[PDB]
Amino acid sequence: YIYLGGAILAEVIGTTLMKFSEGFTRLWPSVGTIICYCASFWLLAQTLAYIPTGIAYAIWVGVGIVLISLLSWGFFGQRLDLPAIIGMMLICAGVLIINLLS
């Protein structure tokens, strides 16, 4: 399977685990989070062995924001009609335009 899909998913899980849980996580040992950080770098290194960095970055930002928006609504219950989402979308549209002219 693609390293890139694993790598984006590893960043989403790993970054989500950064601010999550003042008690100790259900299902998951905390050394698993350390392994996940190591796995994320391994997946990234495989990804940027084979995929050009700037081309990859455009895919990566677009997939990552959507994936964590879906996760934010799904697992954390977050609203889709918050004005911050609109602000984020303006940035997402703007970064896409710069990416096409560079």
Ligand X SMILES: Fc1ccc([P+](c2ccc(F)cc2)(c2ccc(F)cc2)c2ccc(F)cc2)cc1
Of 58, 85, 61, nearest to 73 by C-alpha is: 85
Q: Which is nearer to a copy of itself, 27 or 86 (CB)?
A: 86
Q: How many CB atoms lie within 10 A of CB 51?
A: 17
Q: Does 53 bind ligand X (CB under 6 A)?
A: yes
Q: Does 2 bind a copy of itself (CB under 8 A)?
A: no
Rounded to the nearest 10 degrees, the angle between the axes of helix 30-50 and helix 3-19 is 150
DSSP letter for 80, please: S
Q: How far is CA 96 from the centre of its chain?
A: 17
Q: Does 21 bind ligand X (CB under 6 A)?
A: no
**What residue ranges bind ligand X (CB under 6 A)?**
11, 15, 37, 40, 44, 47, 53, 56-57, 60-61, 64
**What residue ranges bind a copy of itself (CB under 8 A)?**
15-16, 18-19, 34, 41, 44-45, 48-49, 52-55, 57-59, 61-62, 64-65, 68-69, 72, 78, 81, 83-95, 97-98, 101
